[PDB]
């Protein structure tokens, strides 16, 4: 009879096959990633192409059911998911070409290596080769060699391709009536038609910039402090009023400044909270690390891990008899099947990473209660923020002492409080200007506010002005230094790292109140608050069934992202940096460079 009848018929049939095809695909993908063979590549390709085929066909047939005529909102939301997605209006000739550019760019990223000017035929890759240098090297010219070689040998091969990427990507974005592809990406945060919870694409830029401006005072003092310290470790090479050289920031691009901790540590004479040696003295293994994460989630009232998680998961590296992809990854295969893949080492880092990865499992498990197409995080920043807050509580001295990785007589003091906040800021606050700047550059290129003959000109201006970070060597339009980062060459949004950063502190403040924490926020462990897990579960559970603005509001009592919680976390450090930097220069010449 009715059209909303035919729609439910249509969905019930799509969901049945999709639940099966999605699993046959995620299962093959898991096999490959755990055991890299030609046959597993083949199954994964074959199973990839069936789902894609299915989801294309279905998406088209979904248009027969226009949302206006659909009164049921669950059914509407599902039909919308399907109608929107599974759609490439880009012609099959060009799609083919773009699919190649993506592959070539991805290959060049993993494959490319810099063979040493000196060396006959010793060739470093980015991983682990150049990355070992760019983290651990304390030699200016060695870091500068790796930094430049990478950009001038690999980046210059990406420039031809990334120019063509922008053309085909912008065609694709405009065939869907989006202004440009940056606009499409901003569409992940778009709520339209939910009275009271709506959010537009241009609003994202507005809040990212407004929030960023409130963060500038803190990064300015972080930058001033770090620079004053890098003058001691690299005397002669850094101006006291200039940008930080790009090759001195503790990794290949300066995304994180984490590796500068040893150079910039406020009070080195104090103990380092690191518990890797207690983990080893107590003979912890991967099982233990993951059984301790499981206990953390049970303490807030979330479920245990499934039987199948312990049977099907790979929690350690399987040796030389088997080739696994050792990037920590949480999996939601479907049909009640959840697995983590991780080459766990008996380390504090992996301990905390385990909590991050199992947090995604709890998220995926929660929203299994949702219909298939609504089984996703509320926005590209939610899953990462869910990960990060688990790690925030587990890293605290309170929790480590509770699990016995820290002696009951550890002396957490003001200095101990400041060292922690500094190391945290070097990782969290340090990536905020780098993340904002990078996506800004990309937004602008996609928009057309940047001509190809100024791409690198604008990149380094923008780096200097926003990030306070100058190239050590002049780079022409033969370079594509943006694409020298994984996500740029591999076609992925980067604003998710900015949004997830505010979200995560917004979530922690709310869960720490729900848990009724006394002191400063950085010393908060939601470990035994069922009220904290209750509040959290009610958002996890929604998946993508509600607007991200209501999802967020459930947890935090506000409908947009907000920087007060993040700034309240680093307040003690912020007031410490200001007292420290009072005989140093705060601010940067955007013109001083090391090649001046």
């Amino acid at each position: 009879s009715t059209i909303e009848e035919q729609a439910k018929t249509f969905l019930d049939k799509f969901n049945h096959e999709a639940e099966d095809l999605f699993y046959q695909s995620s299962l093959a993908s898991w096999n490959y990633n755990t055991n890299i063979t030609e046959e597993n590549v083949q199954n994964m390709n074959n199973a990839g192409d069936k789902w894609s085929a299915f989801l294309k066909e279905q998406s088209t047939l979904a248009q027969m059911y226009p949302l206006q005529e659909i009164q049921n909102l669950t059914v509407k939301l599902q039909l919308q998911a399907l109608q929107q997605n599974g759609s490439s209006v880009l012609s099959e000739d060009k799609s083919k070409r773009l699919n190649t550019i993506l592959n070539t760019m991805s290959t060049i990223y993993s494959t490319g290596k810099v063979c040493n000017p000196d060396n006959p035929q010793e060739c470093l890759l980015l991983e682990p080769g150049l990355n070992e240098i760019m983290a651990n090297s304390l030699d200016y010219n060695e870091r500068l060699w790796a930094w430049e070689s990478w950009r001038s040998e690999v980046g210059k091969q990406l420039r031809p391709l990334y120019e063509e990427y922008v053309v085909l990507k912008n065609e694709m974005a405009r065939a869907n009536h989006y202004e440009d592809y940056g606009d499409y990406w901003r569409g992940d945060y778009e709520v339209n038609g939910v009275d009271g919870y709506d959010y537009s694409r241009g609003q994202l830029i507005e809040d990212v910039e407004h929030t960023f401006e409130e963060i500038k005072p803190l990064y300015e003092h972080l930058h001033a402090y770090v620079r004053a310290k890098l003058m001691n470790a690299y005397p002669s090479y850094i101006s006291p009023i200039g940008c930080l050289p790009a090759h001195l920031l503790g990794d290949m691009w300066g995304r994180f400044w984490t590796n500068l901790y040893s150079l910039t540590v406020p009070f080195g004479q104090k103990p380092n909270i690191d518990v890797t040696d207690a983990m080893v003295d107590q003979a912890w293994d991967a099982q233990r690390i993951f059984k301790e994460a499981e206990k953390f989630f049970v303490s807030v009232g979330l479920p245990n891990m499934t039987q199948g998680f312990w049977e099907n998961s790979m929690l350690t590296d399987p040796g030389n008899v088997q080739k696994a992809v050792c990037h920590p990854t949480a999996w939601d295969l479907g049909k009640g099947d959840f697995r983590i893949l991780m080459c766990t080492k008996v380390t504090m880092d992996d301990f905390l990473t385990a909590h991050h990865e199992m947090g995604h499992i709890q998220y995926d498990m929660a929203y299994a209660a949702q219909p298939f197409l609504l089984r996703n995080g509320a926005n590209e920043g939610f899953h990462e923020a869910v990960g990060e807050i688990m790690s925030l509580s587990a890293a605290t001295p309170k929790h480590l002492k509770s699990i016995g990785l820290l002696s009951p007589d550890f002396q957490e003091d003001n200095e101990t409080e400041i060292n922690f906040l500094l190391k945290q800021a070097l990782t969290i606050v340090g990536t905020l200007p780098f993340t904002y700047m990078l996506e800004k550059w990309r937004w602008m290129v996609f928009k057309g506010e940047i001509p190809k003959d100024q791409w690198m000109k604008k990149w380094w201006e923008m780096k200097r002005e926003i990030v306070g970070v100058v190239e050590p060597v002049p780079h022409d339009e033969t370079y594509c230094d943006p694409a020298s980062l994984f996500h740029v060459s591999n076609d992925y949004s980067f604003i998710r790292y900015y949004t997830r950063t505010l979200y995560q502190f917004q979530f922690q403040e709310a869960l720490c109140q729900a848990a009724k924490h006394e002191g400063p926020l950085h010393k908060c462990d939601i470990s035994n608050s069922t009220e904290a897990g209750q509040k959290l579960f009610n958002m996890l559970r929604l998946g993508k069934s509600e607007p991200w603005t209501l999802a967020l509001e459930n947890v935090v009592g506000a409908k947009n992202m907000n920087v007060r919680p993040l700034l309240n976390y680093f307040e003690p450090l912020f007031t410490w940096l200001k007292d420290q930097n009072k005989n140093s220069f705060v601010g940067w010449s955007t013109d001083w460079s090391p090649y001046a």
Partner: peptide, 17 residues
């Protein structure tokens, strides 16, 4: 862009298809 993600990570375009 999506519909249903099976693994939390951003895998390289070459081998995730």
């Amino acid at each position: 862009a999506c519909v249903r993600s099976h693994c939390s990570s951003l895998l390289p375009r070459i081998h995730c298809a």
